[PDB]
Every structure is written in structure tokens, then in C-alpha cells.
Design a protein around this ligand. Structure first.
Ligand code: NAD
Ligand code: NAD
Lengths: 350, 350
């Protein structure tokens, strides 16, 4: 295992995408979503996803040159057809539009059609926050999580991402799957041979299990009150599938192979709020400032620490700014054969 | 204990409010919110709240004749100043506005100022659903729930309510506090002398306890992953307080006495979506129909049943339509003295 510079990894991912014969904007957008994940420590959706995207692109699943267009739209809303684009491209574009509409109507909501996996949901949410708007991001995926008291994979890990501008620091940022823990976690624990935390997954009968080998579905967030987490996965499902026209979780094709050619037709939803359309920006920042000052200063349990959403990510982000992002041996090896294959320089390490 | 007709209770609540010298619209709005809770089985926020509202009105906390006005607003947004109105009046009014803005811009968002406790958050969300829009409702309250790993009451029970139109049945409705369970639950368990479920509350040290007498704060939804529940309470806090200009949870005055004269200045947020602004309503209903058809038909655990958000509320709602709402002896006795006091007919029983 070893470290890599965030620019070294960035320039590398973009170089590879271009080599696959991808759009210049599709390459920039796809690398931002992965650099976002890698910079914020959410490595499950970091640069390790490069391998998959190039396979989906070469396979035909992801369109190299997507023509993003608005099928309709009136007022502060509009539905966009990404043209089977790479999730990040389809959603980064949808958000710049939602921000544009928010600048004109105080708010902006955009339904996304014919898209794909977009990596970390917070990428787009954090984009709006960096711009001074409140960004929302919903989406679904192939069924993985059961309902409360369920005995089958029902909803996808249907994430929720909310980004709020700060003042003189990093934006408030929530990026979470509606299930207790994401799916890659069971694969990781299965790989290490360790048991999962209690109430994160269930067997085929709907009864929880801490054995990663017996898991056949993820459990909703909330535990005994998991029905609340299942309900949250419902709101995202409505904004991501019923309101976009795309297929529901249980109707979507697998995220993995063997098919890397037939498009999945994934739906998503983006939302932006213009703080200045409701109140004085000076009173918004002082409230947010006070809100965060108090939160972080709040009493904690024994040897514990309290933090706002995004605080853990800004701590690792700062560390990866100077120290660099860790790249294990097997992902590094994948970077070498990708570099060999596409004739691009591999990331320098240390 | 005995039963009461939903019209008998409805007419009674309205009668009492008018007797206190309240607005005609403030009486209708306040009785709908309570009738909503009583009809849907969420009795914690039903007609048992009458006793408190008349006390807040007579005390001077709640304005009997509120002048709801929009301080500003451009595009599909606007901030409304309820003029210290009863919660239901301030929010039912803000929702009809958000619906009005949604009919014109596809969406409608309204920031509510100088409001008060509005009973069940689903009342307003369900209103938009009955109207054919997708309604959202956010609000905070005085601190009761701790942060993940916290050792102090931080957020209020900050509820989330989302109502989505169905097709040929009752709307999809989510109404849930961000905390695992609402506060009144500790009072009930303390009253019965029984222990609470694991992970719903904590003592003064931030460590969970099932003893309702040792509880000093509620726990976020999610358990070990309660940080997601605390992050959700954060999004509502931002929409309900930082975005409205109203006080944050920890700055708000108590919901109970002894002060029933000084206004709390509670904030809230309302949102409305016009499905027709994104797609053909015929494809929205067929997707929602299929979504619910499959959900309810999904496989369940041993002797369990799966249901969508609101399904449990529509089962008791139907039961309370014909059979009637149960009223215990002590709440009925409060109705008798309220009837005696204001010279209004008490609900007929059976
Ligand atoms: N593209 C897709 O289809 C898809 C689907 C599912 C998940 N994802 C991604 O998976 C990634 C991980 O999701 P997750 O739910 O496992 O993340 P997580 O459970 O690790 O954390 C989610 C949230 O809780 C916060 N948090 C964690 N610990 C905390 C603490 N101690 N105190 C306060 N807050 C704390 C985090 O900042 C974060 O906002 C996300 O980036 C998500 O977008 C993507
Ligand atoms: N006015 C305020 O300031 C305020 C503050 C907090 C809470 N409240 C009110 O408290 C009331 C109760 O909130 P709560 O969170 O305790 O309710 P709850 O936990 O009983 O239920 C919330 C949700 O989960 C769903 N649900 C329950 N069991 C289910 C199952 N088996 N399968 C699928 N779904 C299921 C319910 O339909 C509901 O939408 C709400 O009406 C809320 O608005 C008001």
C-alpha cells in the first residue's frame, strides 16, 4: 500500500477517460465525482470506480458522447434526458441547471432521465453548496435493501445528499445511503472474514445476521424503527423513479456484469435553494455559524466526539491535501495495466 | 374508556376555539390538524392537544386573530410571517400558497415565520397530496434529542412529512420524528412503569437506558448509525430555523409551561411539487400504482406484514370512520369541564 497525489490521480483518471474516446466534459465530470469520493474518504465511491466506468464505457453501457437535453420544463422545473450519459456528467449538468433556475425563481428542481451510476451523491450536493445554494440529490439503484420486516431485496441503497453553504469554512454536507450501511461493506467483511455490525443486514428469510456470507439483503436505517429508513428510501424512489419515468429499484438491471452493453436507464433528482430568496444572507450565515459552533461544542459521551455532517470528510480531505490519498497494492496494479493499455502515464507514488 | 364520532369531536374542538375568541379560520385550521391525528391514530398529536392550545391562547402565547403576511418572495418562493398564529393556521395557509406557487412554477417553497406548534406534520403534507401535489413539511422544537455520541438534548424531534398523491386510493404519507421515537413515549412508559425499547433514549451521560425515569434526552433514528438520524434532524433544522430566521432548537423556549404568554417564535418550512410539470400524470400514477402494488405484495418475515408509509394510518382511519375514535376517561373529563367553562355541547359518546 502507498500514497498518491490528488492531482496525480485526477489527471490520470481524466487521461484514461479521454483515451476511451470519451467527451471532454464527460471526462471532467466523471473524474470530479471520483476525486470527490477519494478526497473525502468515501473510497467506496472513489477512484477505484475507474475500472468499472471504463468497462461500462467500452461495453457500451455508458455513452462516451452524451447529448444532454431537456424534454420539457416550465417555471422552475424541467426534466433532462442525459442520453445514457455517465452519472456524474448527467447529474453535474442537471445541478448547474437547478442552480440557474434557483437564481431565477429562488428554487430549481430537475428530474434526470436515462442516466447511470453517479458515484457519491454528495458530489452534486456539495457543488451547489460551493456555489452558495442548498443542493439536494436523490437516486436509486438495483434492489439491495429490504423493507422493515421484509424478506426480499426491495429498494436500492437509495442515497440522500444535502449540501448547505457555510460561512468561512467548509459547507454542511450529508451524503448517506438509506440503508444502515452501504453494500460494499458486506463484501469487505466477507473478504476479511469478520462479522458485520448488528442490524445492518439480513439472510434470505428476512431475519438479521452478522455473518457476511449469509447476507442476502441490507437492512433499513433505524433498526427496530427501520420502517423510518425504509420510508426515506421511499421518498427518494418517488423523486428518482416515479417522478422521472425511469424504472423502480426492483425493475433496474444489475450494477455489475455480465452485461456492460445494455443501458440501465437510471433516474435521479436534483434540487437547489437560493438562501437570498428567503432571507438576508447575513442572517443566514450567522444562524448557520451559531448552529455549527454550538453543535461541535456540544457535550459528548465518554471519550467520544460530536460533529456535523461532513466534518469527518473535511478532516480526511485536509489530510489527503498534504499527505495524499492511500492506494492499496491491487488498485495500483489496475492503474498500471490501464496505463499500459491506453498509453497514459500512471500516477507517481510515495 | 369509550368511543366518539369524528364529527362530534370535530364540531366540539371548533366550538371551543371560537369560544376562546379565536378566528374562524384559526378554529378550522386547528381542528383539522387535531382531527388529522385522531383519525390517523397518531393520538399523541390528536384532540388531546386541545387542552394545551386553549391554554396557550388564553395565556396569550397563541394569537387568536393572526394576520398572516408575506414579508417577501420572488419566483416560486416566499417567506410568510404568521403573526404568532397557531401552528396549524400558519402552516395550512403556507401550504395553500406553496400549492398556488407550484401551479405556476412547478414547485412552491414557503418559509414560515413567527409560528407555533402545529401538531402532526403530516396534516399539511397530506393536504397537498389530496390536492394532487407532493408536499413536504419541516419544523423544529425545543431540544430533546442528542447528536450521535452526544451528552445533551440538542435537536428537537424535528419531524419530516412527505405526502404523495396515489391514484384510486389514499395518498402515500410519511410523518416521522427524526428521533427513533417521539418524546411523549417516555412519559407514557414512565406512567405505566415499563422500560423503553433499546436505543430510543439516553441518560444524562449520553449512554442509552431503557428506564423511562433515567431518560434525559431522546436518541436519533439509526442506533449505531444514529448519526444519519441526527444529520436528518439537521436538514430540517436548516429549513426550519436557519432559512426562516427563527430560533434553533436549543434557543427555543419550552413547549410546556409555566409561560403560556410569551410567544416562542417557531419556524417551519413548506414545499409543493406539481407532478404534471415533470411528466405525464398518466405515467406518474401507473408508476406509483405499480410501486405500491409490488411493495404491499413483497415477501415478509415470519408472521409479519410489509406496508408503505401511511398504510397503518389508513387502516385505523377507516376503523375510526365507522366505529369512532376512542376517548379515555381522563380526556373525556377534560372535555366536560371545557364544555362547562365555554358553554359548548360536549361530544356524544358510546
Ligand atoms: N451512486 C449510488 O447509486 C449510491 C448508492 C448508495 C450509496 N452511495 C454512496 O455511498 C457513500 C457512503 O454512504 P454511507 O451511508 O455508507 O455513509 P456513512 O454511513 O459512512 O455516513 C453518512 C453520513 O453520516 C455522517 N457521519 C458519520 N459518522 C458520524 C458521526 N460520528 N457524527 C456525525 N455524523 C457522522 C457522515 O458525514 C455522512 O454524511 C455515499 O457517498 C453515497 O453517496 C452511492
Ligand atoms: N409538531 C411538532 O413539533 C412535532 C414534533 C415531533 C413529532 N411530531 C409528530 O409526532 C407524530 C409521530 O411521529 P413518529 O415518528 O413517532 O411516528 P411513528 O414512528 O409511529 O411512524 C412514523 C412513520 O413510519 C411508518 N411506519 C410505522 N410502522 C411501520 C411499519 N410497520 N411498516 C412501514 N412503515 C411503518 C408510519 O406510517 C410513519 O409514517 C407525527 O405525526 C409527527 O408529526 C410533531
Amino acid at each position: 500500500t502507498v500514497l498518491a497525489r490528488l492531482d496525480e490521480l485526477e489527471r490520470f483518471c481524466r487521461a484514461v477517460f479521454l483515451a476511451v474516446g470519451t467527451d471532454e466534459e464527460t471526462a471532467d465530470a466523471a473524474t470530479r465525482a471520483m476525486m470527490h469520493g477519494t478526497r473525502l474518504g468515501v473510497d467506496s465511491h472513489g477512484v477505484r470506480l475507474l475500472a468499472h466506468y471504463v468497462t461500462a464505457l467500452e461495453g457500451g453501457r455508458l455513452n462516451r458522447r452524451p447529448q444532454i437535453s431537456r424534454v420539457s420544463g416550465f417555471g422552475a422545473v424541467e426534466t433532462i434526458d442525459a442520453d445514457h450519459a455517465h452519472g456524474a456528467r448527467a447529474t453535474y449538468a442537471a445541478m448547474e441547471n437547478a442552480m440557474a433556475l434557483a437564481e431565477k425563481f429562488g428554487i430549481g428542481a430537475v428530474a434526470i432521465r436515462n442516466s447511470s451510476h453517479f458515484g457519491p451523491a454528495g458530489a452534486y450536493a456539495l457543488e451547489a453548496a460551493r456555489q452558495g445554494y442548498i443542493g439536494l440529490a436523490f437516486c436509486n439503484s438495483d434492489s439491495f435493501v429490504r423493507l422493515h420486516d421484509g424478506a426480499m431485496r426491495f429498494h436500492g441503497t437509495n442515497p440522500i445528499a444535502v449540501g448547505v453553504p457555510a460561512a468561512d469554512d467548509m459547507p454542511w454536507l450529508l451524503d448517506m445511503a438509506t440503508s444502515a450501511v452501504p453494500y460494499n461493506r458486506v463484501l469487505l467483511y466477507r473478504s476479511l472474514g469478520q462479522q458485520l455490525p448488528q442490524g445492518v443486514a439480513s439472510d434470505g428469510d428476512g431475519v438479521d445476521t452478522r455473518d457476511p456470507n449469509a447476507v442476502e439483503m441490507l437492512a433499513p436505517v433505524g433498526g427496530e424503527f427501520g420502517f423510518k429508513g425504509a420510508a426515506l428510501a421511499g421518498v427518494v424512489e418517488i423523486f428518482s423513479a416515479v417522478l422521472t419515468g425511469m424504472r423502480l429499484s426492483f425493475d433496474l438491471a444489475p450494477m455489475g456484469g455480465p452485461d456492460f452493453s445494455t443501458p440501465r436507464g437510471l433516474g435521479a433528482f436534483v434540487l437547489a435553494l437560493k438562501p437570498e430568496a428567503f432571507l438576508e444572507r447575513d442572517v443566514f450565515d450567522e444562524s448557520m455559524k451559531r448552529y455549527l459552533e454550538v453543535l461541535r461544542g456540544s457535550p459528548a459521551r465518554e471519550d467520544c466526539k460530536v460533529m456535523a455532517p461532513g466534518d469527518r470528510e473535511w478532516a480526511v480531505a485536509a489530510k489527503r491535501e498534504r499527505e495524499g490519498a492511500p492506494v492499496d497494492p491491487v488498485t495500483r496494479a489496475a492503474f498500471s495495466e490501464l496505463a499500459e493499455k491506453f498509453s497514459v502515464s500512471p500516477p507517481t507514488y510515495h
